[PDB]
């Protein structure tokens, strides 16, 4: 079969790896850079820490976004079934458009939710705006996951 060559799972497992590595990279930037800002206010008003763990949770959801598409790419890969190069390019693209989506969303959550938590010890009215900017910066990875799911269902 000229449409299903034997090197096609290379681009599917590359889609798995780009969906997992870059999304957990974004999740790790988003949890580490924000945990810096949460622990920075550890002494000055310690009672605002357990309320401020939201940019850590919203960063950890970005790894679930990559986990779902990595499971759904790895479920379409078998050495006995035929696997087109179209399918491999499509899995490469759907991992690649969720990995950098969650990477950018994790950079945005990490840069927002430590400055916000670090200024939140002065003004207690910041929290609604902080959560709102975190929602706007966390739907960035949801957009990429939507594109990845539509692209996975299209390419198979």
């Amino acid at each position: 079969n000229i449409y299903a060559p034997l090197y096609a799972p290379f681009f599917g497992f590359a889609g798995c790896a780009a969906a997992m590595v870059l999304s957990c990279l974004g999740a790790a930037i988003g949890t580490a850079k924000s945990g810096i800002g949460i622990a920075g206010i550890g002494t000055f008003k310690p009672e605002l820490i357990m309320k401020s763990l939201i940019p850590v949770v919203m960063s950890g959801i970005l790894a679930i976004y990559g986990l779902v598409v990595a499971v759904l790419i790895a479920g379409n890969l078998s050495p006995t079934e035929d696997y087109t190069l179209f399918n491999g390019f499509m899995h490469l693209s759907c991992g690649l458009c969720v990995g950098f989506a969650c990477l950018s969303s994790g950079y945005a959550i990490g840069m927002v939710g430590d400055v916000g938590v670090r200024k939140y010890m002065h003004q207690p009215r910041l929290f609604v705006g902080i959560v709102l900017i975190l929602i706007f910066s966390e739907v960035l990875g949801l957009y990429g996951m939507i594109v990845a799911l539509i692209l996975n269902t299209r390419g198979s």
Binding site: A32, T43, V56
Partner: protein, 197 residues
């Protein structure tokens, strides 16, 4: 000087690609035939070795990040130097993840017969072990660095007040989700891959 080499390699790649494309021979730069004709044992052994290498270079990374600040923060408050070793432990488990995935991958590493050597399954299980070693080593790298950073902040917030370590251990938990998720994905990727036959 490194930017000069990054520009020079880019210029040589563009000149070689446009020379190969203009002369009607542009299909000679053939990445698919490169994937078909290189040995699957390269990809398999390279994936195993980079799995156990890049898990350890993230584990050891996090160990010095939350070790040097633990020892610095323990000078005035030496009552952290044993309780807070769980931040070393959380960034050390990402190496045992890569180790127990590298051994499970090396169980799928036998001698394939030369008549069916570049077959469908043998090449599949080279590609799968390569990228499932990469996605575990890189995930444990990034998880070890993130747990080291969030343990280095915890080692100083512990020495500030004792009730803060319980509150900032949760960030280390959410940071150590990542290596376990890479542990899951690298086992799902090489789940249907057979041995070399």
């Amino acid at each position: 000087f490194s930017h000069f080499l990054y520009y020079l390699v880019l210029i040589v790649v563009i000149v070689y690609g446009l020379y190969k494309l203009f002369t009607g021979h542009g299909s000679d730069i053939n990445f698919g035939k490169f994937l078909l004709r290189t040995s699957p044992y390269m990809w398999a052994n390279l994936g195993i070795a980079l799995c156990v290498g890049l898990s350890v270079v993230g584990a050891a990374w996090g160990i010095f990040i939350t070790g040097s600040s633990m020892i610095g923060a323990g000078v005035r408050a030496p009552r952290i130097t044993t309780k807070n070793l769980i931040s070393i432990i959380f960034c050390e488990v990402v190496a045992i993840y890569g180790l127990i995935i590298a051994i499970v991958f090396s169980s799928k590493l036998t001698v394939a017969t030369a008549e069916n050597m570049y077959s469908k399954s043998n090449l599949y299980t080279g590609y799968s072990l390569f990228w499932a070693g990469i996605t575990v080593g890189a995930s444990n790298l990034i998880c070890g660095i993130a747990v080291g950073i969030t343990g280095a902040t915890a080692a100083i917030s512990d020495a500030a007040d004792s009730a803060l370590f319980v509150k900032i251990l949760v960030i280390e938990i959410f940071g150590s989700i990542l290596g376990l998720l890479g542990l899951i994905v690298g086992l799902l990727m090489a789940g249907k891959a057979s041995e070399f036959q």
